[PDB]
Automatic annotation (TrEMBL), chain A:
Job description of the protein: Involved in the biosynthesis of antibiotic erythromycin via the biosynthesis of its aglycone precursor, 6-deoxyerythronolide B (6-dEB).
Sequence ranges assigned to domain Ketosynthase family 3 (KS3) in this UniProt record: 29-446
Protein name: 6-deoxyerythronolide-B synthase
Organism per entry: Saccharopolyspora erythraea
Subunit structure: Homodimer. Erythronolide synthase is composed of EryAI, EryAII and EryAIII multimodular (2 modules) polypeptides each coding for a functional synthase subunit which participates in 2 of the six FAS-like elongation steps required for formation of the polyketide. Module 1, 2, 3, 4, 5, and 6 participating in biosynthesis steps 1, 2, 3, 4, 5, and 6, respectively.
Amino acid sequence: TDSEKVAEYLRRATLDLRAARQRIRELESDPIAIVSMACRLPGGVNTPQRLWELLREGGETLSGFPTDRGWDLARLHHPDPDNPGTSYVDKGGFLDDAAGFDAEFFGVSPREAAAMDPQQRLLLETSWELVENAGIDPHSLRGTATGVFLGVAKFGYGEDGYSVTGVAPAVASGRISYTMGLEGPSISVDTACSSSLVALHLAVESLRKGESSMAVVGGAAVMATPGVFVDFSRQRALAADGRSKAFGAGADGFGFSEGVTLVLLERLSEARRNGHEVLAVVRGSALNQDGASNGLSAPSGPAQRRVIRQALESCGLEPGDVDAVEAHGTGTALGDPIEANALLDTYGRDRDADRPLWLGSVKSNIGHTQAAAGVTGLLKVVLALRNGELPATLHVEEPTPHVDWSSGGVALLAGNQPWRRGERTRRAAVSAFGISGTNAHVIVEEAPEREHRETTAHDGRPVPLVVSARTTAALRAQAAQIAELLERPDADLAGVGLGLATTRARHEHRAAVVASTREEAVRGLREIAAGAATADAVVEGVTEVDGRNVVFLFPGQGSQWAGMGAELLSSSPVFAGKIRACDESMAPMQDWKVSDVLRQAPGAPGLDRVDVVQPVLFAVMVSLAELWRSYGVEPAAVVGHSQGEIAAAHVAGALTLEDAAKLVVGRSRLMRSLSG
Amino acid sequence: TGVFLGVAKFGYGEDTAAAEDVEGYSVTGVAPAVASGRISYTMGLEGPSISVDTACSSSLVALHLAVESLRKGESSMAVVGGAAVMATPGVFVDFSRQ
Amino acid sequence: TDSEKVAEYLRRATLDLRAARQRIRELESDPIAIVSMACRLPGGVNT
Amino acid sequence: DVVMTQSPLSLPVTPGEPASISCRSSQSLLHSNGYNYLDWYLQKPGQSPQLLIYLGSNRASGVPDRFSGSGSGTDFTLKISRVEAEDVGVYYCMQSLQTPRLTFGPGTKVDIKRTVAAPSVFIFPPSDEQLKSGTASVVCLLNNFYPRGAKVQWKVQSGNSQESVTEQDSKDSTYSLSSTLTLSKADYEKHKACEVTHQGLSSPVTKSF
Amino acid sequence: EVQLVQSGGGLVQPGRSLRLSCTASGFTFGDYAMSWVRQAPGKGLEWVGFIRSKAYGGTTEYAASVKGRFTISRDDSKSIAYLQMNSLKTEDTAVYYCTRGGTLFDYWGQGTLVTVSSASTKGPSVFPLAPSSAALGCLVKDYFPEPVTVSWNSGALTSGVHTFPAVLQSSGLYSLSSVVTVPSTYICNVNHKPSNTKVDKKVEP
């Protein structure tokens, strides 16, 4: 029709235009969800423990120059700041243990493990923990398109054999993808203290280009040699009592020790579709350079204002939509006034009227942490979204008098402020400024609310509790933790063997327990590392082949139990369905019902006449197979004999149900003429 | 205009010892992340500066990133490339005939 | 009749579609150009 | 089956704040498959108007994305997420279920919201040159009576009269009006007086010869 | 991009024709209507001829209240849309411009102003206001032909000065005003293309 094809063309054009504009909008901007996090800060693991707990009050700076490392003491420390080869200020936090490694778990020879920078070992451990704490089985990531975009610097070397020693301290350590088996791009950047931040930026672009599905972003340091603590001491920049004070009355700029941080990013739509967990959203970033300043290492306010405005424009937001900002503290005598003035100029100018812009800094409580500083700031902000509180440590009372602190709507976070949910969706910003002169700004937003769920269980319903992945770890010993890591104060179910990330494929060892009452894991299974058990399966598998071939047997004629169970008939639905189907198939030729005999209901015939015994067993056997096949166990070479030849044929698909049933009954009846 | 480079190897002559470098010319002269900073500071550019390092292919990798920065309307012009090190004799020693 | 209106609307829609496709191509597949080069190489090479 | 159109006819705005305009018809503009035959037009001061959005929500190229259209049946709405200082112009609805369609009519106007001011009326008696040459003239300048609502009565009673207008010219929304009465002195001697009333200035200030 | 090259205009004088036309490029004439809208000074605009022409149909569709007075004409196959304007009238003084559609007036262009009348003259008035107890100005009564520029003291002070364009009014009297505000020496010399007046005014109550 002349008046219809034109309408169809118009409709197609409108739909295509809408789709094209939506695609353009998606390409130029797209929310990125943070799925999981993992960190290793000096003094304690990660997430809550070393965070919302410590961040409530603060502390740190345990000093204690490490003794495990060589680090000749009684010579580095000297009161004279002008001494040639010494350094003052002997404080400064440090990692509890940096030489720890498992080696055998990741499959590396101890000789190669010894000649290995601690950054790589800590990165491997933290990456495994990060993937684990996301509900994603690490073994399923093999062959995917995830990439790593981290930032690492070279901190000292071993000054003291056919290989290594030219590949372990190689900076470009993308061996994480080698061990895990990834295929995305692997990049190691270096842009001084802001490196992690700019690294993050790169990842975002890839996530919007479709060349990667998920990204791993983070940073690390180890501070192996004394090194910096000496050199900066000769520059009179580092100051004593190394507690860094941000926006106060002190000037130290203390170069705090190591720290490792990693986060996992994925496109929001994919995260919603797959069914992962979303913690926070990233929706814009900006990078720039200080340009020609009054010195190689000197901040420039105009560049910071420009980058802040650029980030705000890229996000498509307004400067009045941000409630809290994390600052690049680095407490010195010059950086803090410049940063404060820049923030007042860009975020000020009649912000609201009454709402002040809260300001804080993590480095005032945990230290500079070298290259992994910026991402560490993220680890603060997101937690503030997940607890409805602003962890305002800021261990300094009197503000800096150089900057016009008053006459503005930017209030220092002296105490603590509620951060509850509700209207006016929460937003935050982080910033980083490196030594080389590269500046970065990032805006983050609270995750959408979707939490309804349901409640089930609490019935009898026996639940398997396959071990928490007894694995390649020493074939022993580690079972201990799995025995004790499952301590339940008040909970139930907790399916570990489920698709849950803990799966770990139970690499080699494996173990199991089945119950519905209590734990019973602290029982024999616990002492299985040094003893035996009572009624629990213990296996020494070697996963010779992960997927074994499967065969079934089908000989009976002698089972003759007293009723082939009935509780499974009532509970398992597939068993009952197959039993009923077989009974219906056999109904129109013989009067007896297999279900009635099975239930031992009154009026059922005794298990003496063969005409009942032979068919009933058959009606059971096939059903059992239907159960096994229902659990992903597919046989290949059923070889059962005697009266089970026909059952095997039915399982093999060579015969129909009614044909086999009628053959069974006829054979039994004709044989019944012979007895004694 | 942005800068994208890839370099990493021994710190000049290394060894030796310090003296009286109160200014700090000893740490900002052998850093791999300061080459782009020096180029930007001397030339006066204001684009992003990147000092990537992923071994023998690093230069090409840098090129890829530069393309992205040009297609997003972020940098007007890009200065890509790769620099060797020409450092102290060595390297040959660790290759044990392999 | 109504044919003229439908034709005009279809033409405007096609024009907008062409503009959108050009924008997408410039966003994702815009060719880049090389202006000049410099190098230092073993021996006397320079230029 | 002619269809009328209408609009709020007044919407002072400020930068940053969003804006919305409603537009209703007399009969449904739907077609066999919908796609209401409604278009929006905007004319900036000093240039010919250009199309904004057609067929409901099909914002044309070049137009900033801040504009959006919605509605159906006999009611539609145009929304602007953020208003800026570069758009004052005038906006018109347009229907396409017909063809003999004449001019839009009143449409609607957009101005800058600002605090209400008051006029400062100054009256100037005619000079000798007009009296000795021909007719006379008297002015009743208003001098920044913002917002609109100027009126004059010339109480004596008053026939022919002339007036001018002022626009959003430089600052603080200055609006002014003048009077250009024409009359000889012989018949002007009967009276010795323009009266102006403003929505902000409640008092009807009257000036005499 | 530049397919609107509308040109023409003049004094015409009642009982005459005109050569109003608009040129186009870029697109194709063969599949486009023309349309024509005229905007009256200080009034709403309206369609000149309800053109709906060209294309395959090639019709005319003259507008109401025309009846061939505005001479639809509309030559097509010359990359032009010339519209004849014979037998004009004093009423239809306005700014006319073409369009790039029949029902979707999407692309417009610069119009041409046409005035068909003859009134007023070049006679200034320098009318003083004589404030009693902060107003001052000049009220030149005739400045035709347009335009006429007015300056105060050949520069000097410029604050609180309003050009204040005035209506044509009966008998086509082109009037202007200056209404400069001063507190508590003053020249309102008027410049016109044929001659210059350069006369001041002092206001005394």
